[PDB]
C-alpha cells in the first residue's frame, strides 16, 4: 500500500514548485498547482508550455542543455531567473527514463551575489568535519557516533540530532544524541520496526537526504497531462509531501521540521541506520548544504563499516 | 622584496580596484579597469568613483556589506550597463579594501553554484584518498598528491618540490601527460627560489600565472594617499621579470603553485607545482578548493616526519 502512494508522489510540500518535461519536446507534461503563481505573474503556464517562455535566455539555455547529459553527469543546482519578475530560484534536476523532473526552490534576492560563496562555505565546513571523523582513534562506535551528531548539529542548526541504528529485527535504537537544553532526551530508547515501513527504508537507498519543512503545511497537488495513460513517478523529488500517518507521527513528538540522512554501508549493501535532525519550529536549509551533508553521511558510512570489522 | 610588495603590475586576465576603508570610493585601479568594467560627469572610472555608479544595486550592496567585516569569497557582481559579470575576490590591507575582478562568461552564470560544489566535492574525495593511506611511505603519499592534483586541475605536469636543509630543492614526485620529459629526481639551486618568494608563500598559499608572455598592466594610485598600497595579497599580481624569463626557457607558459606549510615551528616544507605548455586559467572556486587540499596534505607530511 505505502509504495504505490510514495512512488507516484502526487502531493508536494508548498515551499517549492515542480515541473516535469518531455525530453523530446522540452514542453511541460506535469506541474504542481502552485507553479503558475510561483513562476509567472498572475504567457501562462500549463500542459504544453515551452520553458523558453518562462525564464531568461541564459536560464532557459542552461536547462535545455541539461537535457543532453546523462544523469551521473548532471550538476545541480542551476540558478534560473523568471522572465517577467526576475525572481530567482534554484532548479534541482533529475531524470526518469524519458522525463526530466525539476524542483524549484526559492532564493532570496540579496542571496544571489553570495551563491558561489555560500556553496563553498557549506562544503568547506563539511570537509572540516570529515577530517575530525578521520582523526578519531578506532575502536569505539560510541565516540564515532557522538562526533558525527555533534558535527551535524553545528553544521545544520537543528534543535535535536540523533543517530538511529536498525537492529536485525528491524526495530530501531537511538544510540547517540545532542540537543538544545530544554528538550527531553531520547538517548537509549528503542522503537518498533513498524514506525518505519519497509517502503520508506527502500526509498532511503536511493534518496539519501530528505527534508520536511513543516509537518502542518497544506500539501499541493501535481497535475499531469490527461493524455498520459500511466502515472509519472515523482518520488525522486526533493519536495515530496510526507504521508499523513508520518505527518501525524511528527506533530505528536513536537518535531515540526526534519532532515534525515540515510547511512548505507557497502555502497551486503545495507541500510545501517539514520541521522535524524528534528526542529521544534519550521526550518528550511538550502540545497547546497543538503548536498554537502550527503557526502558527510557517505564518509560516516565508511567509518561505521570499518568499526564493524 | 621591494619589487614584489611595492611593484605595481598585475596580469591582464582580470582587473583590480582598491577602495578607501571609510568612504568606500576608488583610491586605486589597474589601467585596464575602465574598459573591462565600463566598456570605455567624468571618465566613468577614476580616483574618487563611487561603486554605486559601476555595479547593479544588489552587487553594490553585497560589496558594501563586505566593507562591514568574516569574508566569504567570491562575490558575484554585474556591471551596471552591460550586465557583464565578474567574480570579485576581496582582501584587506591597512588602508584599504582591495578587490580582484575575474571575468565569468555570461552564459555560465546559471552554473556558478553547481561548478563551485563540484570543485569542492572532487577535492573532498581526494582528501579521503590521502587519509586512507597506510602511514610510513612518503613516496606513496607524494605520488598520490600529485595524481589527485593532476586530475583535479588538468595541467600538463604536476610535481612535488621538496626543500632541503640548505634551501636547495629536489623534485621528489611527478606526473605528466605522455611524451613530456620527466624532471623527477633533479636537484636545483637554492637561488632559483629567492627567500622573498618563500616568505610570500607563507601568506598567499596559492599562486596562479596564466601566461608568462602576457603584457603586464600598471596599477595607478592617488599620489597623495598617506601610505603605500601593497599588492602582495592580490590574486592578479604579476610575476617578477626574472621568473617570467625563467618560465619561458623551460616551456612552462602557465603555472599554479601551492605552498606546503607544516605546523601551520612554521616552515615551508615544499611546493606542489603545476606547469602548462600553453596558457591556462582556472576559476577561483577551484583554486580555493586546492588551498584546503594543500592544508590537509601538509598535515600528513608532518605526520610522516614524526
Ligand atoms: C502509519 C500507519 C504508520 C507509519 C508510517 C510511516 N512512517 C514513515 C517514516 C518514518 N518514520 C520514522 C520514525 C521515527 N522518527 C524519529 O524521529 C524516531 C525516533 C524518535 C522514529 C522511530 C522516520 C525517521 C521516518 C522517515 C521520515 C522521513 O523521510 O523524513 C513513513 C514514510 C513517510 C514518507 O512520506 O516518506 C510512513 C508511511 N508510522 C507509524 O508510526 C505507523 C505505524
Ligand atoms: C632572477 C635573478 C632569479 C630568480 C628569481 C625568482 N624566482 C621566483 C619564483 C619561483 N622560482 C621557482 C623555481 C622553479 N620552478 C620550477 O618549476 C623549478 C623546477 C623545475 C624551480 C626550481 C618557482 C616555482 C617560483 C614560484 C613562482 C610563482 O610564484 O608562481 C621569483 C618570484 C616571482 C614572483 O613575482 O612571485 C623570483 C623573483 N629565478 C632565477 O632563476 C634567478 C636566479
UniProtKB/Swiss-Prot annotation, chain B:
Protein origin, superkingdom: Eukaryota
Residues given in the record as phytochromobilin binding sites: 242
GO cellular component: a single term: nucleus
GO molecular function: phosphorelay sensor kinase activity; photoreceptor activity; protein homodimerization activity
UniProt feature coiled coil, ranges: none
Keywords: Chromophore, Photoreceptor protein, Phytochrome signaling pathway, Receptor, Repeat, Sensory transduction, Transcription, Transcription regulation
Translocase in keyword set: no
Post-translational modification remark: Contains one covalently linked phytochromobilin chromophore.
GO terms (BP aspect): detection of visible light; protein-phycocyanobilin linkage; red, far-red light phototransduction; regulation of DNA-templated transcription
Residues in GAF domain copies: 186-306
Entry similarity comment: Belongs to the phytochrome family.
Function as written in the Swiss-Prot or TrEMBL entry: Regulatory photoreceptor which exists in two forms that are reversibly interconvertible by light: the Pr form that absorbs maximally in the red region of the spectrum and the Pfr form that absorbs maximally in the far-red region. Photoconversion of Pr to Pfr induces an array of morphogenic responses, whereas reconversion of Pfr to Pr cancels the induction of those responses. Pfr controls the expression of a number of nuclear genes including those encoding the small subunit of ribulose-bisphosphate carboxylase, chlorophyll A/B binding protein, protochlorophyllide reductase, rRNA, etc.
Assembly and interaction partners: Heterodimer between subunit A and subunit B.
Protein name according to UniProt: Phytochrome A-2
Gene that this polypeptide is encoded by: PHYA2
Amino acid at each position: 500500500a505505502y509504495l504505490h502512494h510514495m512512488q507516484k508522489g502526487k502531493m508536494i510540500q508548498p515551499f517549492g514548485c515542480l515541473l516535469a518535461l518531455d525530453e523530446k519536446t522540452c514542453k511541460v507534461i506535469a506541474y504542481s498547482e502552485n507553479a503558475p503563481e510561483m513562476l509567472t505573474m498572475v504567457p501562462a503556464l500549463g500542459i504544453g508550455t515551452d520553458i523558453k517562455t518562462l525564464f531568461t535566455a541564459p536560464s532557459a539555455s542552461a536547462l535545455q542543455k541539461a537535457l543532453g547529459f546523462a544523469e551521473v553527469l548532471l550538476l545541480n543546482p542551476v540558478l534560473i531567473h523568471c522572465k517577467t519578475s526576475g525572481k530567482p530560484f534554484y532548479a534541482i534536476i533529475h531524470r526518469v527514463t524519458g522525463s526530466m523532473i525539476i524542483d524549484f526552490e526559492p532564493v532570496k534576492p540579496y542571496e544571489v551575489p553570495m551563491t558561489a560563496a555560500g556553496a563553498l562555505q557549506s562544503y568547506k565546513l563539511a570537509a572540516k568535519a570529515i577530517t575530525r571523523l578521520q582523526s578519531l582513534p578506532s575502536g569505539s562506535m560510541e565516540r564515532l557516533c557522538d562526533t558525527m551528531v555533534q558535527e551535524v548539529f553545528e553544521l545544520t542548526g537543528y534543535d535535536r540530532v540523533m543517530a538511529y541504528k536498525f537492529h536485525e529485527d528491524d526495530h530501531g535504537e537511538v544510540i547517540a544524541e545532542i540537543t538544545k537544553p530544554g528538550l527531553e532526551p531520547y538517548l537509549g530508547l528503542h522503537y518498533p520496526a513498524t514506525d518505519i515501513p519497509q517502503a520508506s527504508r527502500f526509498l532511503f537507498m536511493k534518496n539519501k537526504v530528505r527534508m520536511i519543512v513543516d509537518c502542518h503545511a497544506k500539501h499541493v497537488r501535481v497535475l499531469q497531462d490527461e493524455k498520459l495513460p500511466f502515472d509519472l513517478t515523482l518520488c525522486g523529488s526533493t519536495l515530496r509531501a510526507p504521508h499523513s500517518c508520518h505527518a501525524q507521527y511528527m506533530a505528536n513528538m513536537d518535531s515540526i521540521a526534519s532532515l534525515v540522512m540515510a547511512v548505507v554501508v557497502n555502497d551486503r549493501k545495507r541500510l545501517w541506520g539514520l541521522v535524524v535532525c528534528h526542529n521544534t519550529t519550521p526550518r528550511f536549509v538550502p540545497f547546497p548544504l543538503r548536498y554537502a551533508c550527503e557526502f558527510l553521511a557517505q564518509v560516516f558510512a565508511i567509518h561505521v563499516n570499518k568499526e564493524i570489522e
